[PDB]
């Protein structure tokens, strides 16, 4: 039933060999776990979704990895309660297409639709609407968790078992296997966005745009920013903000199916600077999911710095541009309020995603970035991380001990284990 497979995260780095189970039969998954629990210690088990996490949180070298993608039954969708009851292996793309005809919108979407509900919960994923909607965990009304004792537990965010529910959110698989969840969806009357585009010339302008109160007018906000140019250019951005459109805001051609699923010589001169300002500046543009949300040998790096530490954030950015490591795909956003999950990554503050080409000295440079992020009160994201230390991680998440204590109640014999758990000492 299990196949010895060579696994890696999305970054295609740090491989380890695991016996991978792949079954639609929930019963065989249950017996598998009990089989891991019976054989004493061993290197335990971990669930895996679509493998989109860049790090080592869904591989388990020398142990068992359970592939959850064949558990992809959508059980029910209800437009009146706005609830969706789905297996953990359903992906958000499948969920998005199933839910649209009910006037229901997946409440948190990440940069790719190929992620499982299970993965979305376990990494407590965020998106472009974090400042208005929180993260994925905020919208989960219930989940069924297969715990180390072989029993399936029904968890809810309030009432008893709350502690365990909030340990599972952003718990990277380490409380057990989410089999099934109920999600509350966002009502919508269209599959479209209405978007305002703003272009800044400086980091200080980017920050001001995000501090002037304009952010409250928009449910979705993000920006591509310059991580390469010298200041004051550094941190100039193409900002894209907006909301889901209502049917009366759609052009006529689109009002009958409102919920339809869907370099040159001038380039571095002043004429292109002008083109770039023009084409990035607009009001009330209607856009489908792709145009607005997916507008598009590397090391993905993501951090958030708390809101108040704006000087510190600016400094980190400068260290990056003077580093001699050049990143082109840079996404910036201001996160809103955090949730109660002790290992949830997002906090209110300045979030950035960069992508460095693997080069001589990068490894030791990002270690130095880790220290700055730590010192400035931020954290890195397990979904993006393959290489930080246990000591850095623990200090970045001061509620880790509180989280560890919950995991020890639910998994006393350390039945659930991963490459990340051992590296980050969450085992
Ligand atoms: C191109 C790209 C863009 C991205 N953009 C964003 C973004 O904008 N925002 C964001 O937050 N993230 C983003 N991500 C990261 C991605 O959203 C998360 O890594 C997500 O957790 C991946 O889902 P997955 O199903 O592939 O899970 P995997 O990568 O297979 O697993 C991730 C973690 O979830 C756990 N897990 C999976 N299934 C279960 C289950 N059934 N029960 C318990 N635990 C489980 C795993 O054990 C592992 O710890 C991006 C990734 C890529 C490749
Ligand atoms: N950081 O990676 C990041 C943060 C956010 C936000 F929610 F915090 F704002 C959003 C976000 C995103 O929407 N997309 C990202 N992509 C990274 C990789 C990608 C697709 C989208 O970019 C080009 C390449 C083809 O794939 S990251 C991101």
Numbering used by the authors: 7 to 268, 284 to 317, 331 to 461
From the paper:
Compounds 12 (BTZ0434) and 13 (PBTZ16914) are the most potent BTZs reported to date and 13 in particular shows great promise for further development. For 12 (same as BTZ043), the enzymatic DprE1 IC50 value decreases from approximately 1.5 μM after 10 min of reaction time to approximately 120 nM after 100 min of reaction time. The nitroso derivative does not need to be activated for covalent binding to Cys387, yet the time dependence of the inhibition is much slower than that of the nitro counterpart. As was proposed previously, these data suggest that as 12 is reduced to 8, it immediately reacts with Cys387 in the active site with little chance of escape by dissociating from the enzyme. Unbiased difference density maps, calculated with phases from structure models prior to incorporation of the ligand, demonstrated that all five compounds formed a covalent bond with the active site cysteine (Cys387). The complexes with BTZ and BOZ inhibitors induce partial ordering of the 315–330 loop in some cases (compounds 1, 2 and 12). In fact, in the structure of DprE1 bound to 12, some very weak density (below 1.0 sigma of the mean) can be discerned for residues 318 to 322. This weak density fails to define the conformation of the backbone sufficiently well to justify including residues 318–322 in the model. Still, this weak density indicates that, beyond residue 317, residues in the disordered loop do not contact the BTZ inhibitors in the covalent complex.
